[PDB]
Write a structure and sequence with these properties.
The PDB classes it as dna binding protein/dna/rna. This is part of a larger assembly, with chains A (202 residues), B (300 residues) and C (195 residues). By secondary structure, chain B is an alpha+beta fold. Helix content of chain B is 26%, strand content 21%. Chain B folds into two domains: 115 residues, no CATH class; 139 residues, no CATH class. In chain B, strands 2, 3, 4, 7, 9, 10, 11, 12 and 13 form a nine-stranded antiparallel β-sheet that branches. Chain B starts with a strand and ends in an 8-residue tail after the last helix. Chain C is mainly alpha-helical and 195 residues long. Chain C starts with 16 loop residues before the first helix and ends in a 5-residue tail after the last helix. Classes of the chains: A alpha+beta (202), B alpha+beta (300), C mainly alpha (195). Chains in contact: A-B, A-C, B-C. At the A-B interface, helix 4 and strand 7 of A face strand 5 of B. Strand 7 of chain A pairs parallel with strand 5 of chain B.
Chain lengths: 202, 300, 195
Amino acid sequence: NRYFFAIRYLSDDVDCGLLAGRCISILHGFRQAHPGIQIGVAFPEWSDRDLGRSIAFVSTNKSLLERFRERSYFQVMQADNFFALSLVLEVPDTCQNVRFIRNQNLAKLFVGERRRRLARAKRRAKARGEAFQPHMPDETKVVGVFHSVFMQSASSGQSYILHIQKHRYERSEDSGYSSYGLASNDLYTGYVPDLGAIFSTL
Amino acid sequence: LCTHLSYSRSLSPGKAVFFYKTAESDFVPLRIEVAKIPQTIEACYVPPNVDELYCRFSLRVEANSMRPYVCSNPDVLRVMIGLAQAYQRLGGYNELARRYSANVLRGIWLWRNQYTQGTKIEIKTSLGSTYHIPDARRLSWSGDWPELEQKQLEQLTSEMAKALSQPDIFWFADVTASLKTGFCQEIFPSQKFTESRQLATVECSDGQLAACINPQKIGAALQKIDDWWANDADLPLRVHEYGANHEALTALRHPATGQDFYHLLTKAEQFVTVLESSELPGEVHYLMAVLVKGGLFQKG
Amino acid sequence: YGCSFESSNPLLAIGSLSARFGALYWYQQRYLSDHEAVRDDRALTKAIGHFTAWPDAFWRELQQMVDDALVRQTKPLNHTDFVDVFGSVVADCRQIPMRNTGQNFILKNLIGFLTDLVARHPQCRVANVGDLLLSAVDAATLLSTSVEQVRRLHHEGFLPLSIRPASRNTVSPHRAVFHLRHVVELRQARMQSHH
């Protein structure tokens, strides 16, 4: 009921965080052309120390996934021997699922985010008419492990980082993927198979 | 030369601490927040509703370059003593004092935190003087300082010229600066050296932590007054026996040129002779500056 | 056999014979890559027309490969070698035997271009074109001087070194180490002459 294909990086000096960002950007552009589609992003070479030198895409519609594979960027990168591409094939029925949820809460670890939050809070108080009296939290927080992907803004002058965590799957409800094929903590449920198996194919 | 020769340091700060005032208490520390995520992330910025940040440190100056801490050779000792005095009586300590004094009043010891809406520097000393620079953002290495400010540079130069040259004067300075700041401006304290990064703090007597700048980091800024090479003043280097330049990854007084400390150390007999005929040249200014930042000069 | 020209609008229509010879040699390796077929007349006959719009075509040839290179990027640009984008077009400037800019017109146009390229791309938080690394032999060519002079210029501190080498080693002439924007600015600032 599921199809996938994978891409591996051939060069030993490849920067995974820079390069991975381009594949996501393409997925986004495709999503804009055909709004009613669902394609998920998986990292079959995910590790606790690094992101890994490979990426894979998973979906349910074979004919649509083929169209994605035909996108010119991928074809060029293969021709110049930067990428190794697989063919589209069926997902094995003997595996387990993971989420790949992204966490925007981690933004609050950096000064720039706190500044913006407070500036808005001050201005917001004028409607209430009360004096601006902010109240700060304590000194210690605990967070999980995450990796970064470098991203360019869409039709603007900015760039920023995506922060990716890996959660184990638990089954409930119905699904949907975000514009980046990523999962959200709430109200964006989906999953991908953790295809670290049969990777000897590339 | 000889086997044993040492000088100790003649000029030194303690460390700098950041804090702010409230209506309830005069000393509230600026603190740092840490998230364990070990491998952590952390941040520090002035909190909402504090209009200005204070930074303070103390400085002692001692006339301790007049005599070798240790010397194993009676002939080396006779010369080094004659030289320091031959220099002292022609002046020249004024020149060194002028250079050190200029750096304190300018404020470069604030390193990366100089970018304020207005910085005010106040100095007090153990002899009863007070100095006031209403705005430190406009004073260059090279140029004529505005009136009433040029004057305090002369007055401070005089007190320090004495502190450096006559013994049994116990001279202390207490330097406080005020930084008028932005809405939630980021602050840059000293970092920790490790085998992600961490920041340095100190403990208060009540158990609170505070942000700080290390002693030698304040010191490295004060002694940056070496511009006697290649007849091109540019900006000054931190005094170093080899003329090291970290930004360009090079060395200006490389031993290959004959312009380093060790070649010059061996000509002392000739310099004393000249001073007696005296004008002070760059070669003796360099040497005196190194003796002030004392260390080991051994295994000749 | 001689020059004898007037109303010499093309950049190939002026100068001493040695330069006129060098310009043709350069054109040939670069655009007549087809194996020799002893088309000794026809093969070279076309070079004159080619140069007639040079002041406005050479730049487009250079621009085209900035974009094609960019979309194939794999590392942040501030660790990328200058050569990976421009393909040694700089070394080819050495086939004309003269060193100064007023006579070696091929080099004169390449520098013109690079100066403009840097000018429209000022420094910011994310690295961009203009931060590419040059090797010692490349600065020597752009600065119209021999290599030993660059070493002397480094030693006096007129320009920074960006890559930290290991100890008990040396950086060879072929190693890529200065930023492009640093070389372009230094040249405008202190290398000009009446040539």
